[PDB]
Amino acid sequence: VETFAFQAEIAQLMSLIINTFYSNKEIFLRELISNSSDALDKIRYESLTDPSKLDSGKELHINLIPNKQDRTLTIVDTGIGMTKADLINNLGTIAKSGTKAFMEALQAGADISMIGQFGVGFYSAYLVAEKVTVITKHNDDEQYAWESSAGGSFTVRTDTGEPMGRGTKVILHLKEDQTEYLEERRIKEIVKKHSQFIGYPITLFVE
Ligand SMILES: CN(Cc1ccc(Cl)cc1)C(=O)c1cc2c(Cc3ccccc3)n[nH]c2cc1O
């Protein structure tokens, strides 16, 4: 298990998201689904020049899995996945410019709902989750588990859980007062409102 500090600006954006009063929390789902969609476009595109890239799974989809007992909402995709270099350094470097532009936009009167336009949409997960666990598998690498409860740090470890072939799985450990995102009618209403035109099947699992 390796522990890493977030870049100062990312830690700052996460504290802003956790501490600001903002009732329109549902926007987190559209952001996560959008990231899943981008990952699926990436593997779909790469497979046109190299079909062997689909040997770790042909089906390109998104699964929404609520679990009332564990108090979790899982977003699973069969996209390109991420390498250790994406998790640790690469994505953090890009997030720096996006974070800065977003905070600047917020000071100038922009809304938290515009987070996605700055490429930092993922951090809206902290409107509803006390902890986020990300399981990922890229064709060129091993299966990894990324994790953060904010507080300025994240961990990366090799995942010795059930293999997932290829893709990314986002496990949202919800805050006690955010259990409405475990309700079928609530998730359906959110998907229909903000994610109706995603070019991949979205299956909302029932309990
Ligand atoms: C290749 N991609 C697409 C991708 C990558 C980076 C970004 Cl910033 C956006 C999209 C994925 O595997 C991927 C990532 C994410 C994230 C962001 C993230 C969380 C923790 C650690 C790292 C990144 N949320 N939901 C996702 C779903 C995905 O399929």
- Check which CATH number belongs to the domain holding 64 and give it: 3.30.565.10
- Separation between Cα atoms, residue 104 and residue 126, nearest integer Å: 20
Ligand 1 atom at shortest distance from the alpha carbon of 138: 12
Helix/strand/coil for 125? helix
Please choose from 10, 123, 168 the residue to mutate so as to test ligand 1's pocket, defined by most ligand atoms within 8 A of CB: 168
Nearest-CA residue for ligand 1 atom 21 is: 87
As annotated, the binding site for ATP includes 35, 77, 96, 122
Tokens for 172, please give them. Answer: 């949202």
Residue nearest (by alpha carbon) to ligand 1 atom 27 = 36
Ligand 1 atom with least separation from CA of 35: 10
Sequence-ordered list of residues with C-beta below 8 angstroms from that of 76, at least 6 positions apart, any chain: 62, 63, 65, 164, 167, 168, 169, 170
| CA 39-41-44 angle, 5° bins | 110
The count of other CB atoms within 10 Å of the CB of residue 57 is: 17
Print the SS3 string covering 85-110.
Answer: HHHHHHHHHHHHHHHHHHHHHHHCCC
Question: Sign of torsion, CA 152 157 161 162?
Answer: positive
Experimental method reported for this structure? X-ray
What resolution does the deposited structure have, in angstroms?
2.2
Residue 166, CA distances (Å) to 17, 58, 62 in order: 30, 10, 13
Quick check: 1 and 168 in contact, CB under 8 A? Answer: no
Give start and end residues of each alpha helix (H) in the chain.
Answer: 8-19, 27-49, 84-85, 91-107, 184-194
Using CB distances shorter than 6 Å, the residues near ligand 1 are 32, 35-36, 38-39, 42, 77, 79-82, 87, 91, 119, 122, 134, 136, 146, 168, 170
**What residues have CB less than 8 Å from 138, skipping those under 6 apart?**
80, 81, 82, 83, 86, 166
Domain residue limits at 180: 1-207
Taken as a whole, the chain contains a residue count of 207
Centre of ligand 1 from the C-alpha of residue 6, in Å: 16
Q: How many domains, in total, are found in the chain? A: 1
Strands 153-158 and 72-77, how do they pair? unpaired
The neighbouring-strand residues paired with 97 are none
Bind-site residues = 35, 77, 96, 122
